[PDB]
Amino acid sequence: KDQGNKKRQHGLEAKKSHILAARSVASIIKTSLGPRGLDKILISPDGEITITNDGATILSQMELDNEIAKLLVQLSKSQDDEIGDGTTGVVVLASALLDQALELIQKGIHPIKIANGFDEAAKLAISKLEETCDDISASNDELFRDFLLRAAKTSLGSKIVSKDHDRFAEMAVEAVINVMDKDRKDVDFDLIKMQGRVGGSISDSKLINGVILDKDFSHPQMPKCVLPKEGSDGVKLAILTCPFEPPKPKTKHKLDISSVEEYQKLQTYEQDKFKEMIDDVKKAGADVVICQWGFDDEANHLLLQNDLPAVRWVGGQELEHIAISTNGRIVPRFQDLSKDKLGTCSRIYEQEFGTTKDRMLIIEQSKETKTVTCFVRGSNKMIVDEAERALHDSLCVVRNLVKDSRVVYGGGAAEVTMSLAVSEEADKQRGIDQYAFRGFAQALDTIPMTLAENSGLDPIGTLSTLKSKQLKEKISNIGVDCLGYGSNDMKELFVVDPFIGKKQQILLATQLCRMILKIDNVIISGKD
Amino acid sequence: QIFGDQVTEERAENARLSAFVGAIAVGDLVKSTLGPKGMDKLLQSASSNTCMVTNDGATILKSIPLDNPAAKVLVNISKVQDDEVGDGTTSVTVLSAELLREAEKLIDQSKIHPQTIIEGYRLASAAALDALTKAAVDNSHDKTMFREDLIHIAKTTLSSKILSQDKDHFAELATNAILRLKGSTNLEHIQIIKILGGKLSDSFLDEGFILAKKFGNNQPKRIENAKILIANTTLDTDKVKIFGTKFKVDSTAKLAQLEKAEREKMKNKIAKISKFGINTFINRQLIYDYPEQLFTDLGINSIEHADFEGVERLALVTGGEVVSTFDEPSKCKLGECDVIEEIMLGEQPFLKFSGCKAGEACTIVLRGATDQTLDEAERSLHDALSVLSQTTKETRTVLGGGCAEMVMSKAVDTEAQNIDGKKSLAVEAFARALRQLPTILADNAGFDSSELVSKLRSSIYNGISTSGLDLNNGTIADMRQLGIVESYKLKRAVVSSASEAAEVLLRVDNIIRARPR
Amino acid sequence: ILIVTSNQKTTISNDGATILKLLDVVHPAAKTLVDISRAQDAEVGDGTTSVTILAGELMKEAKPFLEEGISSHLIMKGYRKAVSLAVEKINELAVDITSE
Amino acid sequence: KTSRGEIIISNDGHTILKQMAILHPVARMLVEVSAAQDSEAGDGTTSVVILTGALLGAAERLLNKGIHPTIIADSFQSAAKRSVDILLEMCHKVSLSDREQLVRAASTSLSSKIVSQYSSFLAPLAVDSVLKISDENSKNVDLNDIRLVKKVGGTIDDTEMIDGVVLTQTAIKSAGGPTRKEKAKIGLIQFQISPPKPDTENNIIVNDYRQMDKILKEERAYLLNICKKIKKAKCNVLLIQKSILRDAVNDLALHFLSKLNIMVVKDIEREEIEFLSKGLGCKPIADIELFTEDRLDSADLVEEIDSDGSKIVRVTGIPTVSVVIRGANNMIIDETERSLHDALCVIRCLVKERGLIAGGGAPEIEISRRLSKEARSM
Amino acid sequence: NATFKNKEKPQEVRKANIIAARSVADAIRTSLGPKGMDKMIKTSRGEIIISNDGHTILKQMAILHPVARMLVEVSAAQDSEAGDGTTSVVILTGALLGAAERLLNKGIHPTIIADSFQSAAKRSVDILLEMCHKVSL
Amino acid sequence: IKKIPGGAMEESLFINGVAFKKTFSYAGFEQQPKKFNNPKILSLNVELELKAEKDNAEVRVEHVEDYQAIVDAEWQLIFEKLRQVEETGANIVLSKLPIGDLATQFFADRNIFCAGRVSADDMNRVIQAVGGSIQSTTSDIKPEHLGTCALFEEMQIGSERYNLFQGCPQAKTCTLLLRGGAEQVIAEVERSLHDAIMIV
Amino acid sequence: FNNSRSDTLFLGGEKISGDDIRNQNVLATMAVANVVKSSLGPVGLDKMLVDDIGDFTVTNDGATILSLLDVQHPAG
Ligand SMILES: Nc1ncnc2c1ncn2[C@@H]1O[C@H](COP(=O)(O)OP(=O)(O)O)[C@@H](O)[C@H]1O
Ligand SMILES: Nc1ncnc2c1ncn2[C@@H]1O[C@H](COP(=O)(O)OP(=O)(O)O)[C@@H](O)[C@H]1O
Ligand SMILES: Nc1ncnc2c1ncn2[C@@H]1O[C@H](COP(=O)(O)OP(=O)(O)O)[C@@H](O)[C@H]1O
Ligand code: BEF
Ligand code: BEF
Ligand code: BEF
Ligand code: BEF
Ligand code: BEF
Ligand SMILES: [Mg+2]
Ligand SMILES: [Mg+2]
Ligand SMILES: [Mg+2]
Structure with a gap:
């Protein structure tokens, strides 16, 4: 059916095409793998300009029609989903592999038999790493904090953020400690509001121990800040999801008014009814009101006179963070108030911003709440929007370290240990699986080599050194002098990649290969 | 293959160019809109008949459509700088761009890696930005001196614009208008009202606050020792929020009852208010014919419709509080002033209040011979109100007219003495680009810029760190001696906000446009 | 295989049923191979790839006769027995076990 | 002939430029300077432009000999604010006492308009009318108080100052037509004589045989008593302020107001109110429950004279003039109005700024001769 | 480190040439040896031809890319000197170019590869002779 | 079966x-x-x-008190049915229909977990796991109706939170999440696995 | 079904390889042969071959039938 507008590919060409298509996607992003990497301006068809060293993000934005690329688009994506840092690299390794696989094919090898070869050599490397890796959690407490940081830092060196990487790193380290527990080892990112606004530089990007939100503070006359109300236990605040307006049904209405009788009673009904709420909150003994939905002109004024700063309209996730931040309860009706369901926050101020007529507000807490707000700032949108994703990247590497305190020293060395170990087992293999193992390990070598290429070092050169040194001594961790400094040895240099991620990466590529190779037939149609 | 349907890729050489050209291009658009001897550019939008002339950098850039990323990056950097400090909008793009220009030099013809060019800049920036703080003297204390300081900032932040003419005049206006608040950095408290006719020098700041909208049906055309109740409450059919209240009767008479019944609610609420003892009632909301008649007959003047901002202004000059609950007089700060007379501003009715309780809300009336002149004098003023508004929230100050950046030049050009190899070059380049500011400044005036700036840099080189460019005799006189102060936040912002621009761009090694829809 | 239907949804699989379902196919005759492949993924769940390879292959071996000038009703009968015998033979070899 | 197709004719520059369709941006600029000439002086909108015309040519000339425009710009300012002073120093100041003069001005003003040969009763018409709300020390006098109402037909001469004031509405076609009441008392009802209008979801339900007339005959009175209270308060002529909200003067409420011999006149625009409360000396009436005999006026005559197919209202004998303009072609009826405004504004200039210079080119020349000498001293 | 950048990058033009060129020695590979199969070309004029002679398949093939056309000329000269092996000479460049594809990846200047390849060849030829089993007519 | 974006083509969970x-x-x-x-x-x-997700009627009252009266009734009408669940002494409250803001807020206060609008074909596998038994009203809720597993957790598998009742020695229905580096491979697994399961 | 694409090896025309072409040839020869397989033997019969003008010729000479029958394709 639909015979026309339908093409077919199969091996002679086909495989070349695919292999090459991968390779080419790669050639673009290879120049972004490294602490010497570079970003790529991507533009939405609408006109949105972005700038980012993030792998996944780049390949998602490249509006591309080649089917194989479409696959590497997800390859970098899936990895971003599972870890949060692989992206830029997972594809590189994948391509290299493909070129390698292809190469063998023109020497008489079966595509599917290479597949099994790679899957095997891979599983081995994963092990030769799973054995050489080091542990952090089980070693110290002040050193865990350090190592956990020394990763977040290394994880940021390939970003514009790099400039102030000290702060951005210690920020990501903190942001995670404060919302996940050593036992559950679960970092729920809903407990971390990644909000950013413009202004200053990326340096003025602090971490807030509460939340932000945008509010003018209901009535203008209202105060700007909020003290702990004399000797009290910090500040108490109302967290209600009921509107400061006369209660209404939820089924019908038609309050039939026969005569001036009842209309006379409604009259005074709404009137004091506003006092029925304004009083209600005073009774629970609170300082400031945070209502999910707006208030009436009357009800507002009262909140003024009664020194009850208010917050008209606050979104779901919004109101909710104000709870968990201040330890309060989300109170339905008005009469459901009480001094014991209030929010025990530590301060509230209406934050100014340059001359921007916006001027949002903030809710602090002093002590590490169960909610953090990394509030990012920058000289221009793109710097921010990149710095936020840059922050995110690190925050993820911090989450992976609690979910698996295992660490491997990157700098390319992590990939050299495999290439070394996997290549050894090659000589023992002999025959066909010999070519596979050699290949797998050989593709790997492109990872460090690429780092050398970007940092300005002769590839073959740094590789022989990295291989020799990491053999003439111990299948340890000797990385590339990516920036300079004394010499190799990612350890001293403090270059660290979480193991858990590295495994995922060196899998996701081989697997993706294992799929493409099995494809020997293709049938594309058009858009009728 | 890959990609498709009009997506466009620019690799290394190409990308880098796209970028560099863009920024350089943007910069070379607003270089003329700098310097006290600078010029304006006329522009016109989708309506054609919507021209406008301006010297505001950020203004021009915000408008001018572009397709080039690197350019939009610079445009955007301008709007940012325009936000957190209201000024320097131009000085920033230019210095930002010139830094990139100075970079493609270190690349295309020196062969230095951009990352190493960043390495150097990042250092140069530290040193540059530093020397600023390390040389910025302030007058936070001595409120009678900082007045003189602050007034200079306006004096010079106004040169270059049309107002540069009667700059001395607007100098005071700005200063005074900000001080009359002394606090709120929110400039929405000062209302600017403009009307054609006569010289700009005729503009003024009514220290009594003027307001639009006349009062009452035909009330007293002038109040005396006014005691005003500033309020915002529903004034056309109440029942506030009981919605659903139907009136089913079995005869028209029972309607007629309920009808006058409603019109009673009004005489009720209107009464609870009269109990506040006031000779003027201003409501944000409106007030229909009847609820007004009440006032016209009680002597209380009804001045309706002043939105939100319109009340907040009055509530800061008169000293009252918004209010919407008259459920009890007192406990409601009532506002007051000396007179609420109705004046006429060239064919127009206005309300000149007078002697208010320390007006922390004011009105500046601008007068130009053409709408163009007004609308430009509009922001040309805003460029003053904004800095000053910030310097009260940042007392630090530094001398401009070249001086400032020229000092940061000698700073960087110095710290470029202790450095590695290649990096140094970027560092030297920084100070170089910085130096291009006084150059471009002097250029516009018309002097042999090269020659003049080299004289300037020479003084600041060999000590002094005070000389600047007298863009009139075309000599290099002492700036502190000539009242050419500039906000520290401003200059520090430019030297910062720009360096960020640079880094974000130098780091690009590819550009990809998608299939525009 | 890798089929990118006119839908734009790209798929990659081996369930012969899934492939023969994405080929659209409108030729009456050739469209039955799509049906018997679907049933195979029902009454069984596997072998879908093969039901068609065979189904086809037989039709292939019928060509010589049909060409040489033989009735089709005779070829139809011939194959009919062939299946009957072949089917019983499988039942005859169906190694039933449990702890054998 | 505007984009809409409406045709216009005039000597008023600001209005020619405005309706001209000027395209170039810096060209549009001229319209704004002529716009402001109208906003301050109110006259000379033509001259202000022609000035920029060669003042710009002055730069065209100087820019040729390489003088920086910012030297020309800033210098031009000083040469102007020096010219203005020369105007004053040679200004032959007058006082609003001098009616002999103020008419001479307004007259030599409109001596370049279609209504030139009618300057006779036009020149002072402006003068008197401006002074009628001028007082003395009022500085800028508002011209809103000089309600001009143009009605097509006749020629230019058929225009009178009208003792009292001039309304703009029809009267009564419907039930019992009054249209004229000598020595009457008028009331500006802001109310609305219609059935019960409850501002909340009203509704009159029925469920009884007899209940029919109950609802009916009842409201039949509702309009009645209101109508009586009017007659009762001795309200001769009624004026209802156009209510689009929900009815003004019910068709029924007219049968009553018809019998009661009360000439009613509806659709009184909201911007009128304020003004009508002056010329009519009347008083706005929010409700009926505030409709009292004192909230009325001493009208000596009210009548809708049908000038000829035209019909214009009048309230004669009672700080507000009211002039009615006529002409043949709408281009006239309109133009003359603006050619009266140039004159009316002429006076306004003297209300806010005493004195007047000998026009006719003479002052232009003087400032020229003066600056010309002072130039040698620079 | 921090030294010389190479702002310029038509690095790709090389790999692009190699690939658009190697694709030529691909279509040929199938016709090498006692198991090589002939190609059938229907010229622009409409004349049909069949053969295993490479130089003639490439000649009549309609190769479009420039550096790709280059192969036809090397096969042309293989015919002009030996007269045989026109198929082999091409297939050689085919992976000899791939040899550069591989080396260019590890950043070896092509002029080092180019000049080296010469010496590695004029050394290969000598090995041919040194192992050549000379005959007489 | 369930498919989860990302992960190794074998980091799948049973x-x-x-x-x-x-x-x-x-x-x-x-x-x-x-x-x-x-x-x-x-x-x-x-x-x-509260107001119900669907279905209604009309409330007509001529007394001011009736208004505020009917309101207090609505509320109590919900809360009751709501506590009626609390009364069942449950820790996990699932429903093929919604669980409004107020509702989920309530259980949240008294450490009771929930989820509204559960997949229809899911509740049926939920029953078969903890051995519960669907209930339409809150009234006659008897205890052999409920169910209990060995362990419940809300995972963050493949950047997607996944409520899962693992460990249930009394189940007649399992569920399995599949992983992969591309929506094509997870898809092929699910089909490569149905061909196996169906043969077993 | 249906061969297509190119990707590398930019050639000024069509080019089928292996199975695809190898079958095409067989199909070709097949058709051109099958037209005249009904003219073989004594029991075989002649055919009428009309042109465009409408005229024709009836003949069993396989060679003239294949000559008269416009064949476009090498193997044909
Ligand atoms: N500081 C460094 N020194 C040596 N190697 C580093 C350094 N920073 C990052 N790397 C190497 O680069 C890898 C990260 O590449 P990057 O460009 O950040 O892309 P992604 O991290 O998204 O793959 C690290 O895993 C490590 O192999
Ligand atoms: N009176 C002056 N003499 C010399 N320099 C001045 C003078 N007035 C302001 N400048 C310089 O003008 C420059 C700012 O130009 P401007 O057109 O105002 O751009 P921005 O938008 O950056 O304010 C500053 O470097 C300031 O030092
Ligand atoms: N008997 C054979 N067994 C193995 N190889 C042979 C045999 N005879 C000749 N060949 C090979 O056939 C190869 C290719 O020949 P051909 O396809 O004709 O291309 P050319 O001869 O133009 O290189 C020769 O290089 C030779 O090595
Ligand atoms: F460059 Be990756 F995303 F850290
Ligand atoms: F052009 Be700037 F804002 F003075
Ligand atoms: F392809 Be089958 F279903 F194994
Ligand atoms: F033409 Be002018 F304005 F009298
Ligand atoms: F094919 Be070769 F030239 F014998
Ligand atoms: Mg990273
Ligand atoms: Mg400025
Ligand atoms: Mg005139």
């Missing part, structure tokens, strides 16, 4: 009980423990919103 999405679309969550060992699962079928 849930012993049942696993399902995370339809939990309401405020007040984040409270409610996200993990229980032997919780008292309430496989409920319908509603749990």
